Design a protein around this ligand. Sequence first.
Ligand code: PBE
Length: 269
Amino acid sequence: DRVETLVFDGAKTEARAIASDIAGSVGELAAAARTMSGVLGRGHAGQSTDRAGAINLLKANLEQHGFAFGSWFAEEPKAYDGKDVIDNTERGGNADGAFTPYWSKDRNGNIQLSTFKADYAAEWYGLAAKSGKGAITQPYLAEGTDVPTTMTSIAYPVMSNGRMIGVSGVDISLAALADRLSAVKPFGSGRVYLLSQSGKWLAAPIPELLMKEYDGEGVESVKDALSTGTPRMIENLTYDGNEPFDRVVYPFSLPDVNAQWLVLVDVPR
Ligand SMILES: C[N+]1(C)CCC[C@H]1C(=O)O
């Protein structure tokens, strides 16, 4: 159809715009995470930074990049400095007794020093540690944040003389993503959303959908778009009665973290 084709093109053109903005923001944070992983690693190799200073330096990633919700480092057990660590949040000690510093934002938009559990099998640690390369997580509810907040994490292995000593990473709150999708505008009576590597909701119509897997109308096309990496269009779906619209899905590779996301662009009839 010449109408549906034009809707498909216009939505594609705008999804292309949205994807390069998200991909750019992501790639820039990934670079800041990888840099931090380096200075934490080299600072360990040459005893240029103690455990106290590692916390000092870790705050730089939030002061310089507003799009990062938090900056953290989970240390392989006893790896950093081997000192006793039980419960000293000002020195990166969790209840488990492990070096886990965490700078994050609180409810009022200020920076606080938190601490988290060393869940080595968790995506934010396992992915980067098993591949040896930078990685990005499926959306998950963060623990060490002041207020519970749903975020995705870009994590990199921290190396010290050819042996890894832990994982450092940066966070993108699911709200920050939602904000960007309104800073660069929707279709005008058009809404844009965002799916994760596996089709989980990163930016959704209602917040109840976040972190859940897509199973609305046109689900198979989402799975097929995710495979081919090419765009699909779900025709005529209804948030019921009121105005029906088309759902265009637009995969796009994220720069350094070995993953792709879907832009969803909703255009009403
Ligand atoms: C500290 N983090 C933001 C990063 C790793 C775990 C996560 C958290 O649970 O808070």
